[PDB]
Design a protein around this nucleic acid. Sequence first.
RNA 1: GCGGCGCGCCUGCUACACCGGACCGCAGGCGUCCCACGGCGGGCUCAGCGAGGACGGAGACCUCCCGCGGAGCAGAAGGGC
RNA 2: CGGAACGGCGUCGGCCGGUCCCGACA
RNA 3: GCCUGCCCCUCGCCCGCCCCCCAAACUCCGAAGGGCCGCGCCGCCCCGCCGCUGGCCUGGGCGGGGCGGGCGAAUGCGGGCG
RNA 4: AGUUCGGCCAUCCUACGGCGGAAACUCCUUAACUCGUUCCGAAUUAGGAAGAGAAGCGCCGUCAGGCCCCGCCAGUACUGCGAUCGGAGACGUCGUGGGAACACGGGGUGCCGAACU
Lengths: 165, 147, 51, 291, 156
Amino acid sequence: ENPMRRIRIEKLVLNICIGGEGDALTKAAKVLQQLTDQEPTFSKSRLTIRGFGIRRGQKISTHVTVRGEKAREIIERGLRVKNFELPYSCFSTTGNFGFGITEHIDLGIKYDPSMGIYGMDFYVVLSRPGFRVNKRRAQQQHVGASHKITPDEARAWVEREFEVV
Amino acid sequence: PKIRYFDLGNRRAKVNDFPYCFHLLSGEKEQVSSEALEACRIACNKYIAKKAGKDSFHLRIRVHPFHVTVARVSIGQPLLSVRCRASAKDYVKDALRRAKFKIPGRQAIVESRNWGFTEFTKEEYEDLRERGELQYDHRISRKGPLN
Amino acid sequence: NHTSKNQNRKDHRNGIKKPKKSAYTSHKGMCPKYLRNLRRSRANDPRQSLR
Amino acid sequence: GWVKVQKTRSYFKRFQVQFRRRREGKTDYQARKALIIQDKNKYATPRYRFVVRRTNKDIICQVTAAELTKDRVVCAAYSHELPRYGIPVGLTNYAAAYATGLLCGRRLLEKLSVGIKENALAQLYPGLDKATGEEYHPDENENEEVHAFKAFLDIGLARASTGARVFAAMKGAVDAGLNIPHSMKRFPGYSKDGFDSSALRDRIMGKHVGDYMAELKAEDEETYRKRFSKYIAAKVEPLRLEAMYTKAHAAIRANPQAVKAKFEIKKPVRQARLTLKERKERIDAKKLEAL
Amino acid sequence: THSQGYRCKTRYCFARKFRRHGMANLTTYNRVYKLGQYVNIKVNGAYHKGMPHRYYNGRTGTIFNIGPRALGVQIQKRVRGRIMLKRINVRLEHVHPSDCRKNHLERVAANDAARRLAKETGQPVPCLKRQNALPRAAHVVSIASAIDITPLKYDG
RNA sequence: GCGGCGCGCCUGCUACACCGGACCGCAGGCGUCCCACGGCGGGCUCAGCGAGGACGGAGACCUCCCGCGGAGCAGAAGGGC
RNA sequence: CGGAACGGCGUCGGCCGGUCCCGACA
RNA sequence: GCCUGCCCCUCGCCCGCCCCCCAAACUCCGAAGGGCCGCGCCGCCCCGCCGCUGGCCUGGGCGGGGCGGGCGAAUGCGGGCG
RNA sequence: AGUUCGGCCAUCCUACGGCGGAAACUCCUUAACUCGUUCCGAAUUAGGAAGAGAAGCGCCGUCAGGCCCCGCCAGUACUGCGAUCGGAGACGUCGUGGGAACACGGGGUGCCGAACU
C-alpha cells in the first residue's frame, strides 16, 4: 500500500520463431515493428538441430522489447484475443506472466497478401519502482524479498489492470 | 570384482532390533584376496541361515576391495560384522570361525560394546531409550532452526 | 647407471665457497638510468677523479 | 518438485568473498591498479589522482594521493559549496560541474601556494582568467622551476562518453591551472579534426538548460511550473544563466578558500545487539511455546 | 623426469590459496622497496608475466636494482660445491618485504635505547647479550596439593 | 636380433612437503593451427538450475530469476582467470 | 631343532565367567 | 476398483537425511623433517653532488664533516684466492 | 550519524524476518539538447526534483548455513634419531626427541584512516 510499491509493466517481448524459410522470418519481424515502433532484433540460435531448416545462426526467432504505457496498449489487445481469459499456470515463479496469439490479424492489423499469418509469444514482465538496484552499473545489489513480485500478488494485479479473471 | 554384495541377510531391519554385533577384527596389515572375501561371506551366511532365520542376522562385509582385485587390510580393521537378535546370539560366533579359516592371518571374533550399527554404547543406548532423546534411523542435538 | 651417491661428500670436501665481494656489489644488470646518474654524481666535488 | 539446492553448504565454504568495495559495487580495483601505479624508481613520490563522483544531488570532486593504509585527499570540492558562490540550482549541471572543477583546482593551488611568494603555485599558474571554449594545457608552454600539479582523472564506473558531466570537471581543473591529461574528443564539439569551441562554451555557460527552459515556456507552461519548479523559486531565467555562471566562476577564483558550513551528528535509537543471557531467553521463548 | 619445462612440478606451489584467487591487493603495488632491503620471493600464480622460477620460491634475497615495473633480486643458489649469486628480475607482485632482519632491528633499538635509559639512572651497563635459555633456579614448589598417579590396565 | 623410440621436446604422476633424484616405469601430448584465434579501449557475464510464455514438443525460441565458474580461453595435461 | 596356517587331557603361568559344607531321586 | 484415464496402489525415478568402504595422476586441513635469509654498528645534525625523480624547497642514491653512544647468542676455530 | 576516496579482504558472506532515515545516500521524474541501447532512455547519456521508505541501505534478529576463536580429540595418528629390541615375516615395542587431522563441545560475528557534511 506504499506508493513506492506499485506493480507496473516493465516490458512486452514479442517472440516469433520460424524454421529455415528465406523470407518467412523477415516479413514477421516487419509485422512486429509496426505495432511496437521498435525495430525487432533478429535473435538466432547456436544449436543446429535438423528441425525444419534449423541451423546455427538461421534467424530462428525475432524478438522486440516494448516498454511503458505504449506496451500496455498492445498487452490489452492481445488479451482480448484470449477472451480476457488466462490460466493459473501463466503466472511464473517470479510473478512474470505470458500469453500467445496465433495470427497478426487477431490484433486487428490488416492482413496483407504479402504478409502471411504470423504467430507471436506475448511475455509480460512485472516490476515495482526501485527494481533498478539489480541493474545499476554502480552499487549493484540484489532486490529484496519484500520488493520481489510474488506470483499470488501478481495474480491480483492482473484483474485490477486488464480485467482477466 | 568377485563380490558386489556386502550387506547380506536382513539389510531392511531397524536400529534397536538386534543388540549384539560381532566383528572379526583383523590383526595383520596385509592384503585379503577378493575371492576369499566372497568365500567367507557365503560360508558365514550359510551357517547362520541353517541355524536361525535370515531375518535375525544382518551380515556385512566391512572392507570393499578397491586395489587392482585385492583389499588392503590394516591392524584392528573389522572383517565380517553381524548384529543379531538374542534368538540368534550363539550361532554367529561359529559362523565367524568359518570366516576365520577362509581369511589368512590372525583375526578374532570381537563382540560389540554397543548395538553395533549405532556407535552409542549399550549402556548409553539404554539411557537413550529411557530418555526418548535418541532419533531412530543419530543425535537430536541442540543445533539448527528452532521453529 | 645414473647415481648421485657421494656427490654431497665430494661437494663438501672443501666447498660451500661463497660467491665473492665484487659479486655482491656490482654494476651488472642494474638499471642503466641509475648507472648514468651515479657517474655524474661521482664526477663532482671530492668524488670527481677527472683531471 | 524435488531438486538440488544451488546454495549448498559446500558452495558456502568454497565461495571467496570479493573485496569490500567490490561487494559494494563501489570501485574497480583493475582501474585503480593502473591509475595509481608508479615506477618503483620514483619511490614514495606522491602520485595524485582526480576522482570525480556524481551523486543524484551534487557532483563531488576530490584530489587524492593513495597511501599504504589509506587514501589521502589533499583538497576536495562538493557542489553543495557552489550556492555560496552564487550557483542556486541544478548543482548536477555541465556548467556546474565545470564550476566544481574550478573550485577544486583553485582551492588546491591556493593551499599549495599558502605563502610561497616567489615561484608560487597560484602566481606561476593563474589558468584561464574567464571560462572560454578553447583548449588550454597547463603543462604545455609555461613551465620550469615550479611545474603545474599533475593528477589523473578517475571517472570511476561512468562510461567515457562525449558531453559527459564527469569530463566537464576535468576542463574546470585544467582552467584553474591543475594539469590533467586531456584529448578534447570526449568534450562537446569534437568531429573530424574540427573542434567547436562554441559547443564547449554553450554547455559550460548552461545554454543547453537555457534552451530547455524556453522550450517548456512555449510548449507547456504547466510543465515549466513542475519540471523547473526549483529554478522558479530562485528566479533564474534562460538569458541570465550564462552571465550568472560567469560571475560565479569569478567568485570561485577570487575567494576559493574553504568554509566549514553546518554539519550535525544524530546517533539513532538503533535496535541494539543482545547479551548471552538475553539470547538464552529468546531461545527459551521458542522452546516453551513449542510444548 | 623425462620433461624439464619452466613450470614442471609446479602444480601445487604455483597454485593459488584456498580463498586467495583473484587479483593481488593494491598494497603490493603501493609498498616501497628500497635498495638492499631484504625481500622474500613467493611466486603468485595469477600474475603469469615476470614470474620467478620454482627454485627462487621461499628464497630470501636483497634488491640489487629498483626498476620500473620489476625489481632485481639477488639470492644465493647452491650449485654443486659453490654458492653463486643469481641476479633475477621479478615483478612487484611476486616479491614481498622480509621480517628476517626485523628481530635485529628491534634488539638494536633496545640495545642503544635501554643503555641510555639506564645511563640516566643505575650506572652499571645493562647486559645486552641474548643467553640461550639457561638452566633452572632454586624454585620452591608446594607439595601439599599433590595428586598420586598410577598406570591404568589395558581395558582394550 | 626383432619389434619399440627415455634418439629432440611438454603436462600430470612415479618421487619418498626447498632443489635435485632412475626404470624398453604410469597415463597422455608436441613437429602444428590462427593478420585473427593478434594489440588496445569500451560494454557485458558464463555454464546451467528453476519457473513461465503461438506453432512447441525429447529438441529450435524469448523472458524475469538465482547463479565462485560447476562455462569459455585452438589442440596433451596441470595450474590461471 | 630354517619355517606357515593349524593342532595338543604336555608342563607351567595368567585373564575373565558359573557351581562350592544350603555337600558341587536320595 | 474405473465407459476408459496417471480416477487404484506399489516399487523404481527425482531429491533429502544417512551410511559402508577408498585413491597415483583427489585436497577441508596438515606433521615429523627439511630449505632460505638474519643475529653490529646504531642514532643525532649539517651541507656537498646528481643531463636521475618529483607540484614543491620532493625524493632516491652517492659522498664529506662533527656530536653522542658501544662490540651486544652459544661452542669450536685463522681465513681467502690463484 | 551519513557520504566520497581507501587499506585487511566473509567476525565483513548467504537466505530470510523485523526496525529506521533529521541530513546524507538511494529510489524517483522527464527527454529540449549532448549522449545511449543485436531491439528496447531497462541499463546508459542528459535535465531535473512531486513524492518515498517498498527496496537498496544503516541497524538488530535467527538453538540458520557458512566464516572465525578456544578447548578437546591426544601425547592419539604419524614421524626424526639410536637399539645383536621381540617377531618366520609384516609389523609392533623400548629409549630419546617433534608432534597432527576430522569430528565434537563452548564462544564469537568487520575494523581501520583522509577529506567532507
